[PDB]
Design a protein around this ligand. Structure first.
Ligand SMILES: *[C@@H]1O[C@H](CO)[C@@H](O[C@@H]2O[C@H](CO)[C@@H](O[C@@H]3O[C@H](CO[C@H]4O[C@H](CO)[C@@H](O)[C@H](O[C@H]5O[C@H](CO)[C@@H](O)[C@H](O)[C@@H]5O)[C@@H]4O)[C@@H](O)[C@H](O[C@H]4O[C@H](CO)[C@@H](O)[C@H](O)[C@@H]4O)[C@@H]3O)[C@H](O)[C@H]2NC(C)=O)[C@H](O)[C@H]1NC(C)=O
Ligand SMILES: *[C@@H]1O[C@H](CO)[C@@H](O[C@@H]2O[C@H](CO)[C@@H](O[C@@H]3O[C@H](CO[C@H]4O[C@H](CO)[C@@H](O)[C@H](O)[C@@H]4O)[C@@H](O)[C@H](O[C@H]4O[C@H](CO)[C@@H](O)[C@H](O)[C@@H]4O)[C@@H]3O)[C@H](O)[C@H]2NC(C)=O)[C@H](O)[C@H]1NC(C)=O
Ligand SMILES: *[C@@H]1O[C@H](CO)[C@@H](O[C@@H]2O[C@H](CO)[C@@H](O[C@@H]3O[C@H](CO[C@H]4O[C@H](CO)[C@@H](O)[C@H](O)[C@@H]4O)[C@@H](O)[C@H](O[C@H]4O[C@H](CO)[C@@H](O)[C@H](O)[C@@H]4O)[C@@H]3O)[C@H](O)[C@H]2NC(C)=O)[C@H](O)[C@H]1NC(C)=O
Ligand SMILES: *[C@@H]1O[C@H](CO)[C@@H](O[C@@H]2O[C@H](CO)[C@@H](O[C@@H]3O[C@H](CO[C@H]4O[C@H](CO)[C@@H](O)[C@H](O)[C@@H]4O)[C@@H](O)[C@H](O[C@H]4O[C@H](CO)[C@@H](O)[C@H](O)[C@@H]4O)[C@@H]3O)[C@H](O)[C@H]2NC(C)=O)[C@H](O)[C@H]1NC(C)=O
Ligand SMILES: *[C@@H]1O[C@H](CO)[C@@H](O[C@@H]2O[C@H](CO)[C@@H](O[C@@H]3O[C@H](CO[C@H]4O[C@H](CO)[C@@H](O)[C@H](O)[C@@H]4O)[C@@H](O)[C@H](O[C@H]4O[C@H](CO)[C@@H](O)[C@H](O)[C@@H]4O)[C@@H]3O)[C@H](O)[C@H]2NC(C)=O)[C@H](O)[C@H]1NC(C)=O
Ligand SMILES: *[C@@H]1O[C@H](CO)[C@@H](O[C@@H]2O[C@H](CO)[C@@H](O)[C@H](O)[C@H]2NC(C)=O)[C@H](O)[C@H]1NC(C)=O
Ligand SMILES: *[C@@H]1O[C@H](CO)[C@@H](O[C@@H]2O[C@H](CO)[C@@H](O)[C@H](O)[C@H]2NC(C)=O)[C@H](O)[C@H]1NC(C)=O
Ligand SMILES: *[C@@H]1O[C@H](CO)[C@@H](O[C@@H]2O[C@H](CO)[C@@H](O)[C@H](O)[C@H]2NC(C)=O)[C@H](O)[C@H]1NC(C)=O
Ligand SMILES: *[C@@H]1O[C@H](CO)[C@@H](O[C@@H]2O[C@H](CO)[C@@H](O)[C@H](O)[C@H]2NC(C)=O)[C@H](O)[C@H]1NC(C)=O
Ligand SMILES: *[C@@H]1O[C@H](CO)[C@@H](O[C@@H]2O[C@H](CO)[C@@H](O)[C@H](O)[C@H]2NC(C)=O)[C@H](O)[C@H]1NC(C)=O
Ligand SMILES: *[C@@H]1O[C@H](CO)[C@@H](O[C@@H]2O[C@H](CO)[C@@H](O)[C@H](O)[C@H]2NC(C)=O)[C@H](O)[C@H]1NC(C)=O
Ligand SMILES: *[C@@H]1O[C@H](CO)[C@@H](O[C@@H]2O[C@H](CO)[C@@H](O)[C@H](O)[C@H]2NC(C)=O)[C@H](O)[C@H]1NC(C)=O
Ligand SMILES: *[C@@H]1O[C@H](CO)[C@@H](O[C@@H]2O[C@H](CO)[C@@H](O)[C@H](O)[C@H]2NC(C)=O)[C@H](O)[C@H]1NC(C)=O
Ligand SMILES: *[C@@H]1O[C@H](CO)[C@@H](O[C@@H]2O[C@H](CO)[C@@H](O)[C@H](O)[C@H]2NC(C)=O)[C@H](O)[C@H]1NC(C)=O
Ligand SMILES: *[C@@H]1O[C@H](CO)[C@@H](O[C@@H]2O[C@H](CO)[C@@H](O)[C@H](O)[C@H]2NC(C)=O)[C@H](O)[C@H]1NC(C)=O
Ligand SMILES: *[C@@H]1O[C@H](CO)[C@@H](O)[C@H](O)[C@H]1NC(C)=O
Ligand SMILES: *[C@@H]1O[C@H](CO)[C@@H](O)[C@H](O)[C@H]1NC(C)=O
Ligand SMILES: *[C@@H]1O[C@H](CO)[C@@H](O)[C@H](O)[C@H]1NC(C)=O
Lengths: 130, 429, 108, 123, 429, 123, 53
């Protein structure tokens, strides 16, 4: 359906940002997205194409990182299994942009094994300034 | 030339069908409800296309293991009275001694009881006040203490009109044409061993270490490694545990941990250091065939996730073990003594990631020891910067379809198409 | 590393015309691995086409996709006023996932 | 005796002498209904093949010569390279897209032989 | 001489198959779900071997009665709040007036109610403090007061390709060859009458008293006695019971005993004394054909066990009766008036001996009378010193397969084998 | 008319005139699935016998004379004392341990006659 | 009414859904029918109804 992200952030250089992504804004939901789908994290700085940051697995929340973000990105799932989180540390002014979570079968669903970010969510604007 | 109808031609197509179980104290996998077993016919000149990554038998086996698990757990005790405040002290921080008020078989009476809980199964509320870990989100069902978790070999048989083709190519990478094919009635005995990062008690490769990926150039794909010789692993929960029964309702018994008798010690697993290093050299040699001879092969530990996938997670004896494998994957490969891996124990398990369900594993009386065979690995390759001469491999897993893909890779279900037509010089008189 | 190139960065058209958008890859794509995405400022991104030729669920029949090898096209049969957005191709089959630069449509 | 599907790599002429071996093998709680409705599917898949054989006038037969002439628009290979070179799997891949029209031809031919032997038995 | 194939020959073999029900206000045995009934073909020159002691129809009937019983108890009220402390006085020892606190439909409100309980249903905790008898071990479910326990005759029909052979030999001892065979598709109406020590409302033997053991020289084997004429037995619970409905939850009603209107009296059964003595003489005469004419035949009372088997246990009107039959089996036999047998009533029943399950029978309003036919016995012989001239027989039972064996002894299931091969002078052209 | 299995005590020759009576009777919640999968049992037990008759060239027949010769290694009783003294139950208990090889011989003979008739239909 | 839904945790894994606040005005739920369209349809029903009565 849709994906629900947290609010826009203003941060200092050298700090960390933490973004949430939910498939249901009900806190006591039983949605079972994030146990069925992979969740991609994708940023877009102004004047640039989208850049892929990482993906988190439905399987036991195993993350695949991009190599240029591996030393300062953490991808987490909630212990209630109903929200996923991005944590970007050591922020710089080129980390500013709109951050998206996207939902993907990712070649893993048993009939057809397709690949599509079919449900995107929102976008959290992240500004890094001093 | 007239057309001629033949019935019973040896023709098949690819198919998906329901397979049934055969199997040669009750169990989680209800093999007592399966069929008795009985066979193998070689098919000369037959080259058959296999794909272990798009195999519907793997998906059916996954659905069957999950359905047998939650069918084994319906009639057992719901631990909804155990969602109370606990007053917990330390036993000596890894174990808590927790006291609580419990219902009895009389609705108007209470009971002050205690139990030993692991730290991984309790969260504090802000001696201190705790509660069980999945108590706000989940209904917890206690596993039934006479029901065994020990994996029993099951066989998957095709119904009538369907066949199971078996690849006998001993160096088969799981995708493509196989030229050595047989027809079987069912598969070999496949033990549903639930495990992460290390394949346990499986079948070995015939000649060499096998490296199998769906696409070895796609680093998001898992790499299944099949060993040719096993590495035995010895695990123990050394604490002498006492189980205590608490009557919590009419006909309802919660099973607590009573006293530890003797020393408090850590659960651990032991691998032979030289045997593990030999197997890692064989894995590196088979792994250099896809990445270059001058590639540095690095083994690092797990990249993240839930505790099931950051550890070697397994069940044996009825306890659920979560073992740090940093001692196993810590090495760089250029062109008597034991490795001792510490393990933690959980009792509140959520194996299939069901939202709002959890299982309480009841405590096992006595000391647990366990001798298994590491027969394979699940690995993940890090994404490289494409100017790199180093490939880093980390222990993967978490998808149990890769555990059962490592036993069903050689198998295939086909549908027999017995009706053929062909030109002949016949004519109906 | 696979780099995707989208050939005209801005493309101008009138409502009701047929438009070709092109994606050029540096090598040999699998064609189950190429998708198209509609980005417009202030709106949720949307999957348009996956698997080089498959329409999404909420995608009208005016969009289709074709291609093979390193050449991929997204064609709109009749341009509507809501089809005036940036369109990105992206490639699966290895991490990092890479996007394609983008072709923005503006009206005449 | 090669066994069930043992002649699948054999030539079509050599595999036509093993048709009983494939023919007799076509008929015979989480595990409970998985065992159950597989049986109903096997019975239905058997009975529609037997209905097709009865419709074409081939019931009770494993080899059944007919009256429909072989159109050369289906396959133009001669008999020596069909019955001594191809296997049945290769042949099924060759004539897979001409099958339903052959089935309709057999269905009309047998109904005409039925009406003709009905009219001939009235004399 | 050539082989000729025949299809449809009258050939059978012994077989086990699932039989289905037919039957000519809902009941515990769901005969409304059975098919309607409809046919008896005599088979000349056929001698067929029967064994009433290894009959699979008896085992299927047992499994079916237990499954129907626990199917009709699933939708009914679980008496989990009834497991509380009771404060009990005497109604006058045998009846307790017990007062307790009970849940209401509002979760925050309690209710002081009372009920009359039998003494066999309560156990005291050390007016006095009591609780129900199976509250610590069992979940108790209240039997649904619109559901009838009255035995409806059911018929067991064989599926297609199976037949039921029926022995018509009127002096058949249930094992060996029967030379008067018929074929039916289903049995006569068999009433599933659950009783011990005495067979009630059954079929009579045709000419004489029948004595049937699996082996009359093995004293661990029960002796089924079939009467040829019935002995009628008249039982009553003379108390005028008052039923009272208590709302114990949303939509949940407990059924209590309210007042007794009039006198407090004992439940009892009456047998005609002369009729019982004449029947016991006929049993003794048929019993001397296996143990000698000069044998002293003794009838004593039950050797021990649970109350169901030390008494004649039955169900009439919905109440469960446990009658002392010491006045029926008290006699020694050398070569208007009634016997009055006192009965106790239970309301908490564990009929099939399931661990952790019990049933609460709700009280029946009014006065209960039932007139039944004793149509047989289940006896047990005592082991003797082998130099003894006395055989003591005691009332037995407890295995309900002996109840249903006394109606299914003449029946048999066979599988029709229709395909035969023979030699003739034919030849296929 | 005796009814279903009425000729079970009759001689084999006398019982062979009642084969339709046994033949037509072979096909037709706790009490729910008991009624259900009994029907699947009856259907597959019927279809296996019909498949056996089909692969012997005996489909649609109740009596079917074959080409397989009667081995005296099976039974050496003469024709008068089989069809006028024995019943079918006694005969079944006599030749119960030769049945599978008689069945294999019938299955050999019918496939041989099938391809022989196919070969002489090409003339 | 602009309804607010509120989740209450009433047991382990169990959520009751309550109504929270109304945001804005309290108004009555209602249905609208076109008056002329309904009258014309009732005339057609009356005309088909006079054939039986
Ligand atoms: C593991 O992962 C890797 C990485 O993806 C896989 O490698 C890729 O596999 C795909 C499989 O679909 C390959 O695509 C195929 O390419 C072949 C060969 O292409 C050559 O021949 C063509 C003639 O048919 C020719 O036109 C091609 O020219 C185009 O492509 C080049 C780039 O290679 C480009 O520069 C040109 O300008 C052209 O655009 C090329 O010379 C091709 O024959 C296939 O086409 C068939 O299939 C398509 C769609 O199915 C169909 O439309 C066609 O009509 C035809 O039927 C197909 O395109 C791809 O080339 C591989 N890329 C690399 C870098 O290796 C690998 O397969 C994976 N392995 C496993 C085991 O999964
Ligand atoms: C988890 O936490 C629980 C607390 O909830 C611990 O349980 C307690 O453990 C202590 C110590 O082991 C127990 O105390 C012992 O009780 C014995 C029996 O008591 C007698 O006297 C009482 C009245 O005082 C009677 O009611 C009773 O019937 C007995 O007759 C004592 O004998 C013990 O004395 C010890 O010290 C003397 C020296 O002074 C020795 O000579 C003795 O032999 C003996 O060793 C002692 O006082 C207490 O009873 C437990 N409570 C409960 C509720 O069980 C668990 O031990 C803890 N578990 C872990 C693993 O940490
Ligand atoms: C990989 O494969 C290996 C080998 O198949 C597995 O290791 C076995 O694991 C099982 C646990 O499921 C072990 O069985 C347990 O052994 C305990 C001790 O056994 C010793 O002592 C008994 C007598 O006390 C001897 O008969 C026996 O041979 C041993 O010498 C028992 O106490 C356990 O009892 C349990 O089962 C019984 C069954 O009746 C129940 O009654 C009990 O209540 C209790 O539940 C049990 O028998 C076995 O010893 C292990 N073998 C070895 C060689 O270590 C691994 O588990 C497997 N790995 C994975 C991940 O699956
Ligand atoms: C099992 O145990 C329960 C106790 O839990 C018994 O129930 C009690 O039984 C007694 C005796 O039958 C009941 O007491 C009677 O109450 C009648 C009604 O009370 C009026 O007055 C009160 C205020 O005092 C009002 O609240 C009420 O609404 C009525 O207006 C009285 O009339 C009775 O008096 C009797 O004696 C006089 C002579 O003195 C006569 O003239 C009267 O006609 C009458 O016969 C008497 O006091 C009591 O109410 C019951 N309690 C409950 C909770 O029900 C069961 O009887 C017992 N069952 C068995 C089988 O043992
Ligand atoms: C052996 O076989 C005998 C004979 O069949 C059984 O005896 C019968 O048992 C049943 C149940 O115990 C008796 O039926 C009950 O009779 C009560 C009174 O019946 C008289 O009054 C009614 C009018 O009120 C007359 O119609 C009737 O003919 C009698 O004269 C009824 O109150 C009972 O009602 C129950 O069933 C109805 C049915 O709708 C329900 O609505 C009620 O709520 C209630 O549950 C019931 O009808 C019957 O009278 C007995 N017959 C004789 C001759 O005594 C034995 O039970 C059986 N033995 C064993 C061990 O199974
Ligand atoms: C029980 O064990 C826990 C775990 O070791 C103790 O908690 C720690 O106590 C030390 C003591 O200085 C603190 O520095 C840590 O911050 C505590 N850990 C946490 C996670 O808060 C606890 O103190 C022990 N209780 C007793 C009474 O010794
Ligand atoms: C794992 O346990 C096994 C026992 O199951 C150990 O194997 C034994 O080792 C000793 C000494 O090397 C031999 O004498 C025995 O013959 C071995 N077998 C048995 C059955 O006892 C093994 O050493 C252990 N491995 C580790 C790493 O601790
Ligand atoms: C992983 O490997 C590193 C490097 O081999 C280990 O670090 C060494 O540990 C030894 C033993 O304490 C020290 O003597 C060395 O100084 C350490 N550093 C180096 C560079 O060798 C580390 O212990 C290993 N970890 C595990 C879990 O096995
Ligand atoms: C597999 O193929 C080989 C190659 O054709 C078959 O070998 C031939 O068998 C026939 C028997 O019908 C002989 O006449 C040929 O001379 C053989 N040719 C060769 C080159 O050996 C073999 O029979 C096939 N196997 C099966 C089971 O069909
Ligand atoms: C209620 O009835 C019981 C059963 O008769 C009484 O219990 C007996 O009382 C006598 C009186 O002396 C004792 O001798 C017995 O030992 C008691 N029986 C048991 C099993 O303990 C009880 O006294 C009665 N209550 C009242 C108030 O009369
Ligand atoms: C039902 O609950 C009431 C409480 O409302 C109980 O009455 C109390 O009994 C205790 C003794 O156990 C006394 O100390 C209290 O004074 C009583 N009253 C209150 C308000 O607590 C009563 O015992 C319970 N049981 C029955 C059968 O009524
Ligand atoms: C059991 O009850 C029946 C009644 O159901 C009694 O039978 C009646 O007895 C009287 C007097 O002997 C006769 O006049 C009646 O004709 C009988 N039948 C009926 C239907 O009333 C019988 O006497 C009782 N038996 C015992 C042992 O008490
Ligand atoms: C069992 O039989 C014995 C012996 O016949 C009965 O005991 C006799 O009872 C009567 C009546 O009370 C006495 O007059 C006799 O003195 C008793 N003894 C003897 C030796 O006859 C006993 O009553 C019978 N029990 C039952 C339950 O019927
Ligand atoms: C049961 O067996 C008897 C004895 O053989 C059969 O009686 C014979 O019936 C045939 C009819 O075909 C006559 O030819 C014989 O003369 C009769 N013999 C005697 C001694 O009566 C009887 O027919 C058999 N019953 C059935 C139903 O088969
Ligand atoms: C019911 O609502 C519909 C809208 O769904 C109204 O229909 C609109 O009416 C206006 C004015 O008459 C037109 O301009 C629109 O074209 C109509 N359609 C739509 C889709 O907006 C209708 O008036 C309402 N009916 C009632 C009785 O209130
Ligand atoms: C058979 O016909 C289909 C038509 O859909 C075609 O796609 C296929 O290529 C044909 N096969 C052959 C072998 O000609
Ligand atoms: C058949 O064999 C029996 C038994 O030896 C014999 O009595 C009978 O005469 C034989 N019949 C013929 C025709 O030989
Ligand atoms: C039939 O053959 C079997 C072979 O196992 C043998 O046991 C049996 O006795 C034989 N029956 C007769 C009647 O000879």
């Amino acid at each position: 359906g849709r994906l629900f992200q947290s609010g826009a952030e203003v941060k200092r250089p050298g700090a960390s940002v933490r973004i949430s992504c939910r498939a249901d804004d009900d806190p006591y939901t039983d949605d079972d997205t994030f146990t069925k789908y992979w969740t991609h994290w994708i940023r877009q700085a102004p004047g640039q194409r989208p850049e892929w940051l990482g993906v988190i697995s439905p399987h036991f929340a195993r993350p695949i990182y991009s190599y240029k973000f591996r030393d300062r990105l953490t991808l987490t799932r909630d212990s209630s299994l109903t929200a996923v989180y991005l944590e970007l540390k050591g922020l710089q002014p080129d980390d500013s942009g709109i951050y998206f979570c996207a939902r993907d079968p990712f070649g893993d669903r048993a009939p057809h094994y397709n690949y599509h970010m079919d449900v995107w969510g929102g976008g959290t604007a992240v500004i890094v300034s001093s | 030339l007239w057309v001629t109808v033949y019935y019973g031609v040896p023709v098949w197509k690819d198919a998906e069908t329901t397979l049934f179980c055969a199997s040669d104290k009750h169990n989680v996998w209800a093999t007592h409800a399966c069929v008795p077993t009985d066979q193998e016919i070689h098919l000369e000149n037959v080259t058959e296309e296999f794909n272990m990554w798009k195999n519907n038998m793997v998906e059916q086996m996954h659905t069957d293991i999950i359905s047998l698990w939650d069918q084994s757990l319906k009639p057992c005790v719901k631990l909804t009275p155990l969602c109370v405040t606990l007053q917990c002290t330390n036993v000596t921080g890894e174990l808590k001694n927790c006291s609580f008020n419990m219902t009895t078989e009389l609705r108007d009476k209470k009971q002050k009881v205690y139990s030993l809980f692991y730290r991984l199964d309790v969260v504090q509320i802000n001696n201190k006040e705790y509660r069980l870990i999945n108590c706000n989100t989940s209904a917890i069902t206690q596993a039934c203490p006479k029901v065994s978790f020990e994996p029993i070999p099951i066989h998957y048989c095709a119904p009538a009109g369907f066949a199971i083709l078996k690849c006998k190519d001993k160096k088969f990478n799981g995708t493509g044409p196989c030229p050595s094919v047989s027809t079987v009635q069912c598969t070999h005995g496949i033990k549903p061993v639930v495990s992460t990062q290390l394949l346990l008690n499986g079948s070995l490769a015939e000649e060499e270490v096998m490296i199998r990926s769906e696409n070895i150039t796609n680093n998001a794909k898992n790499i299944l490694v099949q060993f040719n010789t096993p590495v035995q692993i010895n695990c123990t929960r050394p604490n002498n545990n006492t189980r205590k029964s608490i009557r919590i309702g009419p006909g309802q018994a919660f099973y607590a941990t009573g006293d530890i008798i003797g020393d408090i010690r850590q659960a651990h697993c032991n691998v032979s250091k030289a045997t593990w290093n030999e197997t890692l050299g064989k894995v590196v040699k088979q792994l250099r065939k896809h990445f270059g001879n001058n590639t540095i092969i690095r083994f690092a530990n797990s990249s993240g996730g839930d505790l099931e996938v950051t550890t070697h997670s397994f069940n044996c004896g009825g306890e659920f073990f979560y073992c740090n494998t940093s001692g196993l994957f810590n090495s760089t490969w250029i062109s008597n003594d034991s490795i001792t891996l510490p393990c933690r124990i959980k009792q509140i398990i959520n194996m299939w990631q069901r939202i709002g369900q959890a299982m309480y594993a009841p405590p096992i009386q006595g000391v647990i020891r366990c001798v298994s065979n590491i027969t394979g690995l699940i690995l993940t390759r890090d994404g490289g910067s494409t100017n790199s001469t180093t490939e880093t491999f980390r222990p993967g897993g978490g998808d149990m379809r890769d555990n059962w893909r490592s036993e069903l890779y050689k198998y295939k279900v086909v549908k027999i198409e017995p009706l053929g037509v062909a030109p002949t010089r016949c004519k109906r008189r | 590393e696979v780099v995707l190139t989208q050939s005209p960065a801005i493309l101008s058209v009138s409502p009701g015309d047929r438009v070709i958008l092109s994606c050029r890859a540096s090598q040999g794509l699998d064609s189950s691995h190429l998708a198209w995405y509609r980005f417009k400022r202030g709106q949720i991104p949307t999957l348009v086409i996956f698997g080089t030729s498959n329409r999404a669920r909420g995608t009208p029949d005016r969009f289709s996709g074709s291609g093979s090898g390193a050449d991929f096209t997204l064609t709109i049969s009749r341009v509507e006023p809501e089809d005036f957005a940036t369109y990105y191709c992206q490639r699966y089959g290895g991490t990092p996932i890479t996007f394609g630069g983008g072709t923005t449509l503006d009206k005449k | 005796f090669l066994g069930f599907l043992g002649a699948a790599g054999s030539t079509m002429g050599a595999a036509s002498m093993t048709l009983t071996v494939q023919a007799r093998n076509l008929l015979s709680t989480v595990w409970g209904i998985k065992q159950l409705q597989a049986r109903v599917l096997a019975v239905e898949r058997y009975l529609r093949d037997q209905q097709l054989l009865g419709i074409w006038g081939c019931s009770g037969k494993l080899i059944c010569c007919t009256n429909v002439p072989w159109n050369s628009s289906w396959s133009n290979r001669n008999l020596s390279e069909i019955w001594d070179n191809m296997t049945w799997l290769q042949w099924d891949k060759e004539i897979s897209n001409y099958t339903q029209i052959i089935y309709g031809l057999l269905e009309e031919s047998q109904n005409q032989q039925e009406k003709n032997e009905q009219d001939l038995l009235a004399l």
